[PDB]
Amino acid sequence: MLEAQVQFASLWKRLVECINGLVNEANFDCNPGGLSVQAMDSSHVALVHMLLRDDCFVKYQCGRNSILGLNLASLSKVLKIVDSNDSLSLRHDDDSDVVTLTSENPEKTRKCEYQLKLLEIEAESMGIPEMDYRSTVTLNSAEFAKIVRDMQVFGDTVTIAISKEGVKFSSSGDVGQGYTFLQAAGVSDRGVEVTMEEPITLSFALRFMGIFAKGSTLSERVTLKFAKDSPCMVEYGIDNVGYLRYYLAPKVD
Amino acid sequence: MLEAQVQFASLWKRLVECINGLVNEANFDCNPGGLSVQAMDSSHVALVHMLLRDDCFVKYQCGRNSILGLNLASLSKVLKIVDSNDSLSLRHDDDSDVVTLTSENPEKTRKCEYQLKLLEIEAESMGIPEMDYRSTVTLNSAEFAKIVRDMQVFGDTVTIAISKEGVKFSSSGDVGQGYTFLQAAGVSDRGVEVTMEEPITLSFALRFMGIFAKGSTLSERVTLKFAKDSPCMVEYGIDNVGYLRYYLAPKVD
């Protein structure tokens, strides 16, 4: 008999969005740890890990370690109609086969309740190739989102070069050739924060880069980790309550 | 002969929207009382009745009861171009076969004039239902619009359950099952008012409540009236110079 009440429904909304863009169904591992979603796309090139630490909710209950699959496509539909600044309780009951969403006014005068059938989804299998180590770059999430969305006019293959205090995005297509340089501002105190062990230059699929970048709604900064010849990682982190990561394979030559 | 000129054309633009949702030609009864439209949708389930009273216009001249058939499609198209803050004169001459919309700039520097051919429309049939209403809820027009656009994600029939302190809007369907609930106590003399004759519960095509709920461009509040086994009424008041009133058959067996 799980329960998970976040305070501003806007979060769930911005999440399911990001994630729906990559898989249309997925399992919600509910542990008293918190909620997590792990999943791959249909072409098995990209990974989603999302954590919501139990201390992220304003209520919580997971004595059990239950799993709930559901339709993201449908959750996305129900979530679009849910006011941004309403509260939102996820809920289950033993073998119910139905999860139930519950929105309430701040002023406690509007109450909505939505109920989705669940699935019925198979074991995750592949997950968590780790750990990149070699180079880290951090930057403006929405800056980043733009840069991908931008490169896409050229090819659907971005190339990321990590230089001494440099991160360079190139692409090629029929149109021609673009790039974008970002020098590293550093380092304190109260811009781009490269931190390489290496000049390393991998490249990636833009379709998928794009899917990821939708994350910029959850976090102002975004972190990119690389390892020559390994699944790279893009991490959007909630400040005190969890993270969203994507891993994606390089192109090989 | 008929001249009828409103100050700000926004009002016309907004109204033809409301009603072009239900029917695409209507007869306008023009009489010295003012303009009135009364129309029924092709399936005979929903009736519109709109009245702009004579004083809604900055000036109004209607010797005799003439009837003009107008293609709401075309009208709507022409109103889309007329500016919100311009004035609009609707005029028709003795045996003119056409009606003419003239619009002027507040500063009289610009003058637009549009002529619409006018149709002959088979007489709009069944008459206004009434009257005794067990119940009467009155909530925010814009809220109500959201509620019916919301319910539409589920299925296309909305059940409206009326309680004291409550009115429940429920759906069902392939995506699942929602309900939005609005409560009604306090506070005189300072939400959602309700009225005690009985607990009553009817349901209705969402297709049509949708068409209705565009009424929220005309009035901050909408009023719902209901009676057992009878056509509900949704009335939006136009600034105390007319009303837009809709009626829909329950989806009873």
Add this chain to the structure above:
Amino acid sequence: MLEAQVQFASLWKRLVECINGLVNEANFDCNPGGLSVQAMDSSHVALVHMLLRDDCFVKYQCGRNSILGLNLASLSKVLKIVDSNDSLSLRHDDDSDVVTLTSENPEKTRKCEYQLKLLEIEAESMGIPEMDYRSTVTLNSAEFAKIVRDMQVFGDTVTIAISKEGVKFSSSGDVGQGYTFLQAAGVSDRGVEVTMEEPITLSFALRFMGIFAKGSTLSERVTLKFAKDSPCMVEYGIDNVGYLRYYLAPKVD
């Protein structure tokens, strides 16, 4: 060598949009007097002339008069991505065959470089039509723009009529008939400025007037010159650094 950096990219962005809606490829003559584009629509009925005087750029080098033909589709695409308020520099090296675009932050913090392949476009026939007569009218660009879009709900041919008093745009079609009238009697002494010799009433292909009107993003005002049985002209002066000028064939039975 050639090198032409404008201060705010906005200009090129709004510019390519204008001409891109007339031809999808065209020639960029760059002489030391400035940049010029002459272009004819495929249907050989209408004409773009566009100049930007050398004083218009923050840096401008053009010792000899080289031509660059290039794809307006691609160019439009690249400039959608470029920030309005970034600098943007245009370069071509001896016979390079590729032009390079270079955007930069005001604060030199992000740098972008795009490269496009150029082409050979064949010279488009007839120079520009010379003789102009005493019909003129100058209005708000944006009001002009609205009027075409407006007149287009009726037909596909606007009829422009210059009188001492004002200019009359009219149009007919399925929907009905419509006109817009504007006047210019006096300013006396602090929008419309007619200055004709004789009354003159031509008509025109709305499709193109639409295309032309996009110019309104360039200049707050717009001048239309006419001449009995001749191609009219629409001029959008850039603010003393250039002009965008369109020529269209009248339509006579």
